[PDB]
Chain A
Amino acid sequence: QRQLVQSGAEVKKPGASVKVSCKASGYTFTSYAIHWVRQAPGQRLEWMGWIKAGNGNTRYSQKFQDRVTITRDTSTTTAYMELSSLRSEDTAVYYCALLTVLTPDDAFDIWGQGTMVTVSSASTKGPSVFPLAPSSKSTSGGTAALGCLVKDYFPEPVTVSWNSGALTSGVHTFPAVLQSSGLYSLSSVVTVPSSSLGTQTYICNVNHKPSNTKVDKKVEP
């Protein structure tokens, strides 16, 4: 399986720089060009530039020519996008991608998972994680609902898995809400059999990369 894995989300001050990394694996690194594409709020996907992973030549969009640098490190099969003089329009999800690899031998298209960059002078804050315990007030049709409340973090995003990814059915991880304080909160819930709460263990795995938060909260009645 060919893949691209990006670095974690960041917050950076206006006027500062951000550098996002893109680790390639599972294919011949030097054969293809890695593109950078961003997706800003309410806006179309926007191509920024490409680098040929072999010889390192680049082409940048006119929009970013003066502010972007794309590089690559072949010994670590990793590409990098640095964007300087950050501005409010630059808050966005940044993707690396092997766009439309259409050769005589191959046809594929691979994207990294995306890196959220927030341009802000506000400080990073990690969340508290609180259980949403199943109870008589959270049962419906032979199921029990339970969850985790991830409160008071900055910037986005938080990600949540259950039981290290082994529990996926019946999960809803909600979009975050913006609190008056400027901090975010989110909820993640799952519905499970009402009959086996005594024998099964449910743990929410919360990640907030900007604050180095990795929490595993067991949720019990």
Chain B
Amino acid sequence: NPDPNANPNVDPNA
């Protein structure tokens, strides 16, 4: 699964 802290700038639920 994706790691949402790989790039904090990415909001995966936008």
A and B touch in the complex (CB under 8 A): yes
A→B interface (CB under 8 Å): 32-33, 35, 50, 52, 59, 98-104
Residues of A within 8 A of B9 (CB): 32-33, 98-103
CB contacts (< 8 Å) of B10 on chain A: these are 100, 102
**Contact between B7 and A52, CB atoms less than 8 A apart:** no
Judge whether B14 and A50 touch: CB under 8 Å: no
Residues of B within 8 A of A98 (CB): 9
CB-defined contacts of A33 to chain B, threshold 8 Å? 7-9
B9 to A: closest C-beta gap in Å: 4
B-side interface residues toward A, CB under 8 Å? 5, 7-11, 14
The residues of B that contact A100 with a CB separation of less than 8 Å are 7, 9-10
Q: How far is the CB of A65 from chain B (nearest CB, A)?
A: 15
* Nearest CB of A to B6, in Å: 8
Report the minimum CB–CB distance from A14 to chain B (whole Å): 32
Question: What's the minimum C-beta distance from A52 to chain B, rounded to whole angstroms?
Answer: 6
**Bound CA–CA A104/B13 (angstroms):** 8
Which single residue of chain B is at the shortest CB-CB distance from A101?
Answer: B9
When C-beta atoms are compared, the residue in chain A nearest to B12 turns out to be A102
Q: Which residue of B lies closest to A103 (CB)?
A: B11
> Please, how many angstroms separate the alpha-carbon atoms of A32 and B10 in the complex?
10
A50, B11: Cβ atoms under 8 Å? no
Which residues on the B side are within 8 Å of A50 (C-beta)?
7-8
